[PDB]
């Protein structure tokens, strides 16, 4: 029954600026006897276990850079990244360990950078695929920011609904951009009933939309 | 020195049971308690409970009584998590985490599904027509995950591997791509190295204009 509540739930901060995450406990995690706060902070990147950054509220774990610090006491706590760096993109969790363990809900930290136009590319289905008889047309947006992007598929300039699935990479830890793959899927049949396959893209890094098309063979 | 090493991924059908192991080394096993932690895909960390590694006495969080049992084999310094009557929503990464300090397992993916192991099909996304993008499409594999490198991991710069998507077939699919100089295309070779361990499907497709 110690509830941990982190805020905000997600946060975008500019490279070089101060990132601040808050954790609040529903009861004190300060142990009277030893004046220690039983609170830790963790950084989790995808595919990995969480990695401990801070414990006893303010003690920095070995090997962790000086830009991370923890402070606060009792029931209110702060994690501070003094000067954010591209590699800091991650989910951050507080943990109380005074009375059992309770993790906070986690805080997704992203980097805020300058607008960046996507590089659009289109890729027709392979011959090898079409033999088994399905068509996967792949549109790729590459190295844009921000995340927001629209991808409309056009077959003979007929707008497509319900047959494309999108997917977005995590923010890249070196240059702070996203990439987005859209796949249009059709039976071999339907792919033969049409000619011009196009994907049209909308963004803020574009005064007007960008198309890439091919003609079926 | 200190290491917590867990067992490998598991695909289970609803109703069955599973037994994840966590083998500790580099310290006196029985001097430190062991925690279990569950992370459902895309979700937060959630404490499952603790085991006293000296007495064997397990303590369970409120949300994990009934189907969950913690046990030890002190003689090989190993903690075990046993989940019974598996449901789809027990699909999660499970972690062992030691009392006091930074030590976590690498985690064990448990997937609960009726569907069968099925290896992908790999398909090039060849370049054509400054910079030219090329890639691979990895289609109709189950379950997650798959890995991808470029040129046995010589080309990592510029690489972007995409999160899988679940298609309405109930099979996964994903693309991996990379942008290169458009002069390099004739001269330089590009191979995407694809691995799906659940079905042993390992593939080194070449990609050319």
Numbering used by the authors:
A (entry chain B): 1 to 217
B (entry chain A): 1 to 129, 135 to 214
From the primary publication:
Structure-guided engineering of pH-responsive anti-PEG Fabs was performed to generate pH-PEG engagers. To engineer the pH-responsive PEG engagers, we determined the cocrystal structure of humanized anti-PEG 6.3 Fab (h6.3) in complex with PEG. The pH-responsive protein interactions typically rely on the presence of ionizable amino acids at the binding interface. The protonation of ionizable amino acids at low pH conditions could induce intramolecular electrostatic attraction, repulsion, or hydrogen bond formation, leading to decreased or increased binding activity at different pH conditions. Therefore, we performed a structure-guided mutagenesis of the residues corresponding to h6.3 dimerization using ionizable amino acid substitution (histidine or glutamic acid) to generate pH-responsive anti-PEG antibodies. Figure 2B shows that the WT-PEG engager strongly bound to PEG-coated ELISA plates at both pH 7.4 and pH 5.8 conditions. By contrast, the pH-PEG engager could strongly bind to PEG-coated plates at pH 7.4, while its PEG-binding activity decreased at pH 5.8, demonstrating that the pH-PEG engager exhibits pH-responsive PEG-binding activity.
Here, we developed a pH-responsive anti-polyethylene glycol (PEG) × anti-TfR bispecific antibody (pH-PEG engagerTfR) that can complex with PEGylated nanomedicine at physiological pH to trigger TfR-mediated transcytosis in the brain microvascular endothelial cells, while rapidly dissociating from PEGylated nanomedicine at acidic endosomes for efficient release of PEGylated nanomedicine to cross the BBB. To further boost brain uptake of PEGylated nanomedicine, here, we engineered a pH-responsive anti-PEG × anti-TfR bispecific antibody (pH-PEG engagerTfR) platform, in which the pH-responsive anti-PEG arm can bind to PEG in a pH-dependent manner.
